[PDB]
């Protein structure tokens, strides 16, 4: 699915990623962790041309295509997904209306028939039901004490509704145990055999919440070590738990 | 069409607006100024809709109706509008699609007939022609040195298309930008539409020349008058205000 | 739910609806009004599918399907309903029999289990009880002075029993408080927040109903629209003459 | 079969029939003629009991019983028939469906065996054949040019199907097509066995020339003034009374 080789990226003329290599195939959950600023977020921000850093070298292929070629919106069409923010107070454009426009934008790109207001309503009912999500998630409002996990419920819902091939997840930002708990839960609820996930995180704890297929340790823009979901233990036993 | 009587607004239980009053009649341009933190921005957020603005007292009347009961989008429908930023980029869907949805949301509210993508496109192509802007303002991209002027360009366009009775423009954050804002407010000026511009400093008033100017200090309009007001204070040694 | 775009309708080879457009979503109650010329009535006869109106242009979609390509009975099946008059009287058979038939036709269409004489008998009791109506509505006969509200009661029991998603009522009836209030109660009694209504009325029935939207029919085309306050707005902006 | 003695009937309080007497026995066809607005039409509606009026005085016996004591429905079960309209668009209620159910309710009332959907279909085809009527008569639709006659074909078909003893046909409608008039003349001839009777009210026309009535009564001022046989019309049109 995804194959990154010798990736070199720069942000504000400064080297962040210095030759990263990483292969992701269908049905796998990869956990990437390590000391922040060492390349955990800019990596994820590169698989989606959202921000505009600069790839100095290396290659990134996605299903046999130069992913670095497409634009952020076109990578969405190809299957690469990353949670986004709903527009603010735009008359006529509710959260559900926009989610629906996003889903159809990708179906048409894919050459599929767009969903109407009703069959999309049916769809939203399913995922909200499958992910045991608050039925009024797209119009609800909550107290600051719930905001954490709330943004995340909205992120997973986008992931359920958008039928992504590979979803990038940046969980490095507050100690929210409830929020991390919704991330881990959504992913598990969304792990068939064809979808892949790249979860980036500094606070390595959600690992013991989803049981990744692979775990990679990132230091100064380079995967330094990687194994299964036991890697954490193998390290603390080999005398390298500090990593 | 707009009358604000003794408005008290708080943000996170902190008092910002302390009894502000202001009337706005058709065909007028009011400029609201004052020392940053005087709440002149919250005055605009309050008229517009919310994020955390608690109206603790007072009234706000628009076209006779009670504005505060209304949601932001519905205020748009009622005729009071503040430019919005476009949603994240999505493949094969241009911002024209949302401008179109917004226009139809307001049209439905105002009891008028919606427009299909062909009818809308014509109406939009008409405005863009009047405001003489880049025919492709909704899909193109400009260097960072052009960001700002470009945002104002889009906003002004939204005003033209949604045709609100009262426009709220908050310029508290670029000579090029001041220019399109100024020029735009002068092209949408029809004698029946009104404007409330919140500016942090006296310059774009040199491009618009308001009917009224209002100094807001400590959460209250403390001094009003015509465009000469700015000079007045400047002379009496109150240039900071 | 219901979307009508540029609808053109002819009757006696005479043009009546002329590019009428209107959307109705779940939970809404809409009112349609104007002179006896704008064919408020032919709009409702067209939605229900009365075999006598020619669609010449436009489109009608319900829950996403082309409603115009459906038979009257199948429309009720899709959830589109308008009260019907009971058949002529036949010995030994009660109107209850036909209502039971109408429900079973709609349930079959929904691929659901039809009810038997008894199960239906049960449900009808429940609806009569909850609507607080005469237990023998389907069989009793009444004095002419009552007939007016008697038909509205039957219309309402029909809606309750058939539970449509979009209710169409034609109140352009040839003015009598008794009946109107009965209608007003039924509507308010059938509002669940998900089923919608379209009320075509000649004249206060709006006052007791408080529709979420109002529309004026000017010779086959909808002019003004907006929430219930519209009727007062027009009355205050001088255009009182429109509605009535 | 039918004995009407000194019948007085008022509509909306304006005396129409004023002591009308008539006897009709098995296998006779009786044409009622006379100036419009007169008792002829109110005579047909009083027998069928449909929206019946106010019988001030007199008696009506059918097969030995007081017909005026029976509801419109029981009288249909007793054997008296007058064409009716099929219920309009009630889900799961087609014309054939309704007919079958009207027939069965009449069979039950009579204590006879009812008919299931297979046996009914056969009676149906059977009758449609007999009358040489279109086979999709109960479902087809037609242009206005054929509107008039299409209605009588439906009335003639109900008549053949319901097995009536006494058929009442009201043909006092003006502007009727010659096409329509023929389907009724033909229908009556086809169903003219030697055991059922017919009362045809048709002064508005000339279908008598087609069916040869056994009796011809001329109704005037609410009373049967003169009556004879199929030649009575030339007898009156020989002695300048044609205007009757």
From Swiss-Prot, chain D:
Domain ABC transporter residues, every copy: 2-244
Gene Ontology biological process: iron-sulfur cluster assembly; response to radiation
Domain of life: Bacteria
Residues bound to ATP: 34-41
Assembly information from the UniProt record: Part of the SufBCD complex that contains SufB, SufC and SufD. Interacts directly with SufB and SufD. Interacts with SufA.
Similarity comment: family membership: Belongs to the ABC transporter superfamily. Ycf16 family.
The protein's role, per its UniProt record: Has low ATPase activity. The SufBCD complex acts synergistically with SufE to stimulate the cysteine desulfurase activity of SufS. The SufBCD complex contributes to the assembly or repair of oxygen-labile iron-sulfur clusters under oxidative stress. May facilitate iron uptake from extracellular iron chelators under iron limitation.
Protein name per Swiss-Prot or TrEMBL: Probable ATP-dependent transporter SufC
Organism: Escherichia coli (strain K12)
Gene giving rise to this polypeptide: sufC
């Amino acid at each position: 699915m995804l194959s990154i080789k010798d990736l070199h990226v720069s942000v504000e003329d400064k080297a962040i990623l210095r030759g990263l290599s990483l292969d992701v195939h269908p049905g796998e959950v990869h956990a990437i962790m390590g000391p922040n600023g060492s390349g955990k977020s800019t990596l994820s921000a590169t698989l989606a041309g959202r921000e505009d850093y600069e790839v100095t070298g290396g290659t990134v292929e996605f299903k046999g295509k130069d992913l670095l070629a497409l634009s952020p919106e076109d990578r969405a069409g190809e299957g690469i997904f990353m949670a986004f923010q709903y527009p603010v107070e735009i008359p006529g454009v509710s959260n559900q209306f926009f989610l629906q426009t996003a889903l159809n934008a990708v179906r048409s790109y894919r050459g599929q028939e767009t969903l109407d207001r009703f069959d999309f309503q049916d769809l939203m009912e399913e995922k909200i039901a499958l992910l045991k999500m608050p039925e009024d998630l797209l119009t609800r409002s909550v107290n600051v004490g719930f905001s954490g996990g709330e943004k995340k419920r909205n992120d997973i819902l986008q992931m359920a509704v958008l039928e992504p091939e590979l979803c990038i997840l940046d969980e490095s930002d507050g100690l929210d145990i409830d929020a991390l708990k919704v991330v881990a839960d959504g992913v598990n609820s969304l792990r068939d055999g064809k979808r892949s996930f790249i979860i980036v995180t500094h606070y390595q704890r959600i690992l013991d919440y989803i049981k990744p297929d692979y775990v990679h340790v990132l230091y100064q823009g380079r995967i330094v070590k990687s194994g299964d979901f036991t890697l954490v233990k193998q390290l603390e036993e080999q005398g390298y738990g500090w990593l």
